[PDB]
Design an enzyme around this catalytic site. Structure first.
Site, PDB file in Angstrom:
ATOM      1  CD  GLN A 112      55.675   7.268   6.345  1.00 61.34           C
ATOM      2  OE1 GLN A 112      55.887   8.295   5.699  1.00 61.34           O
ATOM      3  NE2 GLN A 112      54.681   6.424   6.039  1.00 61.34           N
ATOM      4  N   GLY A 144      49.842  11.105  21.904  1.00 64.27           N
ATOM      5  CA  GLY A 144      49.569  11.906  23.080  1.00 64.27           C
ATOM      6  C   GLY A 144      50.728  12.273  23.976  1.00 64.27           C
ATOM      7  CB  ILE A 145      54.411  11.829  23.939  1.00 70.72           C
ATOM      8  CG1 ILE A 145      54.328  10.302  23.877  1.00 70.72           C
ATOM      9  CG2 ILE A 145      55.584  12.349  24.821  1.00 70.72           C
ATOM     10  CD1 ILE A 145      54.252   9.576  25.288  1.00 70.72           C
ATOM     11  NE  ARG A 146      49.654  16.119  22.437  1.00 69.28           N
ATOM     12  CZ  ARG A 146      49.952  15.199  21.526  1.00 69.28           C
ATOM     13  NH1 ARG A 146      51.185  14.603  21.512  1.00 69.28           N
ATOM     14  NH2 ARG A 146      49.011  14.904  20.575  1.00 69.28           N
ATOM     15  CG  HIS A 200      48.391   6.637  11.916  1.00 68.75           C
ATOM     16  ND1 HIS A 200      49.202   5.936  11.046  1.00 68.75           N
ATOM     17  CD2 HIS A 200      48.267   7.890  11.404  1.00 68.75           C
ATOM     18  CE1 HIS A 200      49.558   6.738  10.043  1.00 68.75           C
ATOM     19  NE2 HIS A 200      48.994   7.922  10.232  1.00 68.75           N
ATOM     20  CE  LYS A 203      54.152   6.526  13.292  1.00 73.68           C
ATOM     21  NZ  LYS A 203      52.711   6.799  12.753  1.00 73.68           N
ATOM     22  CG  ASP A 247      53.111   7.232  17.846  1.00 71.66           C
ATOM     23  OD1 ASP A 247      52.053   6.584  18.024  1.00 71.66           O
ATOM     24  OD2 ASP A 247      53.533   7.492  16.700  1.00 71.66           O
ATOM     25  NE  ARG A 302      46.666  15.145  16.153  1.00 73.63           N
ATOM     26  CZ  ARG A 302      46.495  13.827  16.368  1.00 73.63           C
ATOM     27  NH1 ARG A 302      47.253  13.182  17.282  1.00 73.63           N
ATOM     28  NH2 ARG A 302      45.547  13.185  15.667  1.00 73.63           N
TER      29      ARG A 302
END
Ligand SMILES: Cc1cc2nc3c(=O)[nH]c(=O)nc-3n(C[C@H](O)[C@H](O)[C@H](O)COP(=O)(O)O)c2cc1C
Ligand SMILES: Cc1cc2nc3c(=O)[nH]c(=O)nc-3n(C[C@H](O)[C@H](O)[C@H](O)COP(=O)(O)O)c2cc1C
Ligand SMILES: Cc1cc2nc3c(=O)[nH]c(=O)nc-3n(C[C@H](O)[C@H](O)[C@H](O)COP(=O)(O)O)c2cc1C
Ligand SMILES: Cc1cc2nc3c(=O)[nH]c(=O)nc-3n(C[C@H](O)[C@H](O)[C@H](O)COP(=O)(O)O)c2cc1C
Lengths: 332, 332, 332, 332
Positions: free
Chosen positions: C124, C260-262, C227, C203, C258, C282
């Site tokens: 990145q 909140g993908i949990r 972000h 991104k 991306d 996270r």
């Protein structure tokens, strides 16, 4: 009292819990009762500005009488449950305020006594046992000076009120049906229409096709209504069907609405969606419970002030102007 | 008991927590479990008034049998978890109520014993190990007098039930699969259809194209269903796909729905969206846990009363009339 | 651990509050942070049934490498904040799981050390001070074996993180930017594209026209992303723009998402809306904080199981099939 | 202070409750007050990336003056209620920040004193008793150097503020209307327009047809506004009508908006929906109550930082660019 909600608190204080529940409750899970309020809260008015407000008037002409507000007292059975003077207290306050009062088939004071109060009342009909007996009630009402027959058409039988079942609620022995049932059909409507020259108002219409058929049947009005959430649980609120119904009847009868009207702003919303007038049920009974005739007088004075305030802030010098306001649905 | 919710409270009292969780839970975050209820609560019915209600009937004809209500007991595995009489208590109450009972592949009493109760039952199939073994279960069911094969098509394997994982839940040693798995495909459906003349009902359809293909495959019915939120977490509720599916199949098979039906009003909503009938799962098990056969009898009597009440308040003398009701989505 | 939420609880236990807040927080009122979750929760999948699942595979080919899941570890700066092994623990677990790891410009271990772990990593880029210096970082990454340049394009400067301001948060003296800024423009993208033959992935794209321009600019991918709610507060969630963006680019580059993908179900939703793959930020850091390399291994094993479960329950033997699933927006 | 919400907490600490309520409250049930915030929270911005941000400027030209931000201080009556320096403290901070200040007809310091602070102020007009007297106020304002007349058009009379009624609120004897009412009409607007060459801005427009008529009437601007929820309860929020109004006026006048602006991100949302500028009312008074002139200075510095941050993160080097951003409605 500065809002209708002040009176609900006062009525909850004074009434026995099971009587408060008989008044407050709905059928089933009370989904339709709650939805009446949610539906009104989603409606926003688009006010107009800078119009002449020199002679704002809240009056309307309806069923051949001038009314002081675009409002009538809804039919509510057994009003001696809420105060010893019952229907007479409410009818006296309604008369003095210039607001039509609907005398109930299940009134706890006889319809002739209530009509003698004056104020040009309306009469609400439940279809009885018998065509002949139903028509006698109608003729009684007409003979006593009632000015419209409000035929309730959404009660083939009463809805399942779980609060009342849980409470084991029944009428006190001191409350009776002082005027003393089969499902009504369109044939019943025709029998009533043929029996009286009074305007027949069908209360409890929600389907557009039923509003059109009411006009075709010679109704002079309809009340777009899910009976305060007390009949079919999951019935759409009247306020959600009102605009479509007003467009469909295209001025062929008066279109009233009820369910959850709790302020002059709510009256304005109903008018802006096209209603000729509203009915108000539970708040009138809160005021009756709280303070008898004087309580109902204060409620109607407060509503009159709120209707006049809302109309003028929205740029409407008349209720007709208010019906030409546009609305926007919001999220709450 | 005056609502299905009274029975849930009673079942929560009596069952061990981990058995209540096996019954109540869904997969993943239980998003689809919750959405089944939220989706039904958003549906409002537009009732019709003033129709003839002289002979309201809640009966339907389905899969060649008259049923007393547009309802069947859903397949629920291992019912001895909830009461010692397990499936026999439920099947006896269903028989007496005139409601089809679905015998499970994973029943904790053998399918022949449950079928001997009578009441013309249905049989739910999980595809086994083997085409030959699956077809033997089907033939067993048919030989025992089952009247339809409910082929579950949404369980290639079981969903991830986090309550059960957290509890370390496993069957008590006193609960077994008394009739004693590979993912089913359309080839499996054809093998079943060729093996029996009973109607094959595919349970767990959500995509419109899969409902059409079920008709093309010779299914006699489908159940539009996300398996009570127990399979894919994030699968759409069946009630949200029902109307589109009913339109797509254009009468080519019976279209049932399940997930969250908790009152006769919910039955009415499902009918108004086009369902032929509903299945009811967890509430039947609550009643079984609460009071055995008598508990299930009381539940089915309460549902029958609520369905009849809702139909008549909506102006429907028959379930066919209820399917012609219109609905409106609201916000809750 | 049976869900990603178990790991958040574990990380909150162990981390200093101000480090947990640096990780958890967003900019402003955290409206966009919350909206990432709300937007995913509104998406429901329409699963397909009865498809062949004999060889379900979660693999994808992306940027010339096979990945084990349609997922990569998002760039997250300063991972020694969360565990002493920092980036090396995460990169080792990602390698072992077959998942791409994004090495950050602001890594707390040098990019050459992290790349030596293996696993074909991505790099990145934050645009620096200088074109010449930015391009040296790119060349360093390429020389060390990174396989794609993830150019962050939504950080002209960092957003206003009120938790960090309220905490007075600053890096511990034991955490440094081990690889050692001006706003990037499309000219910067072109300079990078000319400097490397590696695929350049932009991104932080949310506008449809910016996704098209990224393709026109020779990007090999984009990440549709706000972000994590850390940049513009009130920026739309990526998942709300994904479908429109996928349609606009019409296969001209890879489209990742991306925010909140949990769960594997959320991966499935992103795939069904058209994403090539997701990034996860996270939750990876929660697992790192909770249990170091082993924690990240357990997280990636749990996600792999959940992705495979969700795909098969939805009838998808491949990620390509999952991209052909339809979705329905619901109300939550 | 790192957000406008920090200042509300500080003002609630210091003010007498009934003065905090006079400031915070709305009319009726405060539905429109709440809806101003809910409406802004539903708006999401679609930011653009990779644009040149070398010279981001938040300046605008409006009514012939350069302003430092696309913002002005709303008219708020009786500012000595909140701090002893009242209007002079606010006007001094606004001047120093380069932000227009609106002097109120009901100011508690005379308009000539406030105008002597400098900073090119605006003057808000309530229509008086008399055309001749109204026009004298206008001429006074113009003679004192005010640069625009903000004619409030949504107050034929003041709305019903239930908090104030419940509190029995009245002005302290130490707060007076230092410049010392009939409903305004379009004739009043014309009388003002003929009396001054200053731009006339009509504040309180919500209907599209009223915005068009304002242009036709020679207004130089309008403020799309429900008066902070203080006038008609149930009036739509201005932010919900802004986009439709901006399209209808097609550049024929400046279109400002107010109601609930509480951050630079909210300013950005209003700009992206097409506003020329916003007004900010209650937050300025919170800062005045909390810390006098210095409090307002800190608030305006914080807003300036947040506006610049939001613009640049959204790719806008100018407010004009921000007006070309697209938005998406979300669910909150
Ligand atoms: C306690 C109670 C008794 C009622 N009795 C009748 C009745 O006898 N006939 C009828 O047509 N409506 C009856 N209604 C319904 C009202 O006329 C009205 O439709 C409903 O209350 C209006 O809603 P609101 O109470 O929310 O203002 C009754 C309502 C209540 C609450
Ligand atoms: C404890 C439990 C066990 C179940 N077992 C099966 C099963 O073996 N086969 C099947 O097709 N469905 C099974 N189901 C799903 C039900 O048939 C039905 O689809 C779901 O429960 C219906 O939703 P409701 O419970 O909300 O009424 C089961 C459901 C529960 C709650
Ligand atoms: C603590 C933290 C540090 C981050 N650092 C960077 C960074 O240096 N570069 C970048 O492009 N994204 C950075 N991100 C954003 C992530 O790459 C990703 O877009 C966001 O976290 C994804 O959302 P999720 O965390 O909800 O899965 C960071 C995110 C967090 C939470
Ligand atoms: C306490 C108070 C007094 C106000 N006085 C006036 C006034 O005299 N004239 C006017 O046009 N607006 C008046 N307003 C309305 C503001 O100008 C503005 O429309 C509303 O406050 C903007 O919303 P905000 O407070 O949410 O930022 C007043 C508002 C408040 C809260």
């Amino acid at each position: 009292y500065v809002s209708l909600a002040d009176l609900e608190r006062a009525a909850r204080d004074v009434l026995p819990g099971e009587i408060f529940d008989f008044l407050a409750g709905g059928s089933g899970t009370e989904a339709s009762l709650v939805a009446n309020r949610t539906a009104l809260e989603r409606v926003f008015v688009i006010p107009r500005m800078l119009r002449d407000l020199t002679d704002v008037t809240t009056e309307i002409d309806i069923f051949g009488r001038r009314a002081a507000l675009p409002m009538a007292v809804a039919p509510v059975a057994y009003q001696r449950l809420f105060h010893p003077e019952g229907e007479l207290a409410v009818a006296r306050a309604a008369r003095d305020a210039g607001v039509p009062y609907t005398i109930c088939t299940l009134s706890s004071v006889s319809l002739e006594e209530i009509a003698a109060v004056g104020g040009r009342p309306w009469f609400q009909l439940f279809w009885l046992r018998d065509e002949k007996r139903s028509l006698d009630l109608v003729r009684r009402a007409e003979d006593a000076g009632c000015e419209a027959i409000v035929f309730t058409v959404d009660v083939p039988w009463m809805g399942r009120r779980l609060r009342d079942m849980r409470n084991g609620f029944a009428l006190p022995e001191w409350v009776t049906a002082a005027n003393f049932f089969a499902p009504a059909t369109w044939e019943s409507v025709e029998a009533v229409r043929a029996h009286t020259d009074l305007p027949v108002v069908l209360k409890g219409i929600l389907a557009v096709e039923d509003a059109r058929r009411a006009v075709d049947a010679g109704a002079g009005g309809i009340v777009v209504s899910n009976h305060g959430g007390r009949q079919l649980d999951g019935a759409v609120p009247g306020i959600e069907m009102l605009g479509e119904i007003v467009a469909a009847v295209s001025g062929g009868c008066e279109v009233l609405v009820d369910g959850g009207i709790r302020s002059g702003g709510d009256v304005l919303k109903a008018t802006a969606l096209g209603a000729s007038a509203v009915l108000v049920g539970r708040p009138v009974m809160w005021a009756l419970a709280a303070a008898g005739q004087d309580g109902v007088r204060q409620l109607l004075e407060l509503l009159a002030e709120e209707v006049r305030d809302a109309m003028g802030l929205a740029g409407c010098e008349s209720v007709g102007a208010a019906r030409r306001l546009n609305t926007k649905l919001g999220v709450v």
